[PDB]
């Protein structure tokens, strides 16, 4: 019924193996004259409603570095937003998609048209053919 048997040794030598890339984008938003979000590694003492994942792969600039393996729900971009009227900020960080893993490949840092900070994190992993994957002549 239209399935197929594949030679496991062929897969081992590299048949139909492929790279997969995903990019995450984030930027700081403006809420007032001097009220801006800020990239940082958020301290648990000063920021409320933190995510459940690990923050231990972020460097001090709030950005993860290339070469580090990441798994689902790990934070890779730390960002906070202040709470209007210490203990004043709220987490606005971006976790890796729960179903994925791989290696951080490259991190772009720049500014956008409005002058605030702007980052992109590209993650790469390798997908190896397995039971259930689709093929066609």
């Amino acid at each position: 019924e239209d399935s197929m048997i594949m030679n496991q040794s062929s897969i081992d030598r590299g048949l139909f193996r492929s790279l997969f890339f995903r990019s995450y984008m984030d930027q700081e938003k403006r809420f007032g004259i001097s009220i801006v979000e800020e990239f940082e590694k958020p301290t648990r003492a000063t920021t409320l409603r933190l995510k459940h994942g690990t923050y231990e792969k972020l460097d001090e600039d709030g950005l993860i570095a290339p070469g580090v393996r990441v798994s689902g729900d790990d934070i890779i971009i730390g960002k906070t937003t202040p709470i209007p009227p210490y203990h004043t900020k709220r987490d606005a960080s971006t976790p890796l998609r729960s179903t994925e893993n791989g290696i951080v490949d490259q991190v772009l840092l720049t500014t956008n048209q409005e002058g605030l900070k702007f980052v992109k994190v590209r993650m790469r992993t390798t997908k190896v053919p397995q039971i259930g994957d689709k093929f066609a002549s």
Binding site: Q8, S9, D12, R13, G14, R17, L19, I103, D105, T126
Partner: protein
């Protein structure tokens, strides 16, 4: 009672006829040589720097496929069976590679001949990169252009092909028997005339053809098995045939041990 007649021979392939054995034994020998004859192969790559255009695990994947001299591998232990902490001189070979391109023009091709053995078992002829001649650069790994550098440390380990095909000491194994189909194990497809439409085996002249009026021998069994064992150079062809037999012996021996101990 088993007899062998070697038709041709050289370093990396032996063509031979095997006779006075059962079909199952010829087949089990075929499978054992492909799957269970141990070899040595890279199994851990520590990348300290890779600024080439190839992805890290892409380069690492090619490294695993490089055939290494595995002649003395029988005295070496499996990593999973060694009593030591981490990795030592008795269960691994350490290899190192470092390449770089200076100059603003041209391309530096990184070849398998730049793999330098650093540490390994004492006086054992293992962990050496396979080479045809002495002026043969070997297998292409990567290519570098100005300011691109590749500096990696590789750990090679003993393994078998059941776990991953890179530990396979043989490529193809040609195998056939009964070139004139006297046993009638196949029923030939034809449009007009079966004999003219099917090509001859390359061993058709090693066995006489069936007499037109000859009666069907329902007691005849397969009895002559011609096979050619090609290798990748990780082991010499004579070693593969010998160690295939040896490995198959211990497996049967292990079964025999367990019956006389379970009572």
């Amino acid at each position: 009672e088993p007899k062998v007649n070697i038709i041709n021979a050289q370093d990396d392939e032996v063509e031979l006829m095997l006779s006075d054995v059962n079909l199952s034994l010829a087949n089990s020998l075929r499978r054992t040589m492909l799957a269970e004859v141990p070899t040595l192969a890279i199994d851990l790559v520590e990348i300290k720097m890779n600024t080439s255009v190839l992805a890290d695990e892409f380069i690492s994947h090619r490294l695993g496929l490089i055939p290494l001299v595995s002649e003395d591998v029988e005295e070496m232990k499996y990593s999973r069976d060694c009593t030591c902490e981490d990795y030592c001189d008795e269960c691994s070979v350490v290899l190192e590679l470092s390449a770089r391109h200076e100059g603003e023009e041209g391309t530096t091709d990184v070849y398998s001949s730049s793999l330098i053995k650093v540490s390994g078992p004492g006086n054992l002829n293992v962990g050496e990169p396979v080479r045809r001649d002495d002026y043969d650069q070997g297998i292409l790994l990567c290519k570098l252009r100005n300011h691109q550098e590749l500096n990696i440390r590789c750990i090679a380990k003993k393994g078998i092909a059941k776990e991953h095909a890179k530990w396979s000491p043989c490529s193809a194994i040609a195998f056939e028997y009964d070139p004139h189909n006297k046993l009638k194990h196949t029923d030939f497809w034809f449009e007009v005339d079966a004999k003219k439409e099917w090509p001859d085996s390359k061993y058709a002249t090693w066995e006489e053809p069936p007499k037109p009026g000859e009666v069907f021998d329902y007691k005849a069994k397969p009895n002559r098995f011609y096979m050619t064992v090609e290798t990748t150079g990780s082991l010499k062809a004579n070693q593969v045939f010998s160690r295939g037999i040896k490995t198959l012996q211990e497996k049967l021996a292990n079964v025999l041990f367990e019956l006389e101990n379970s009572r």
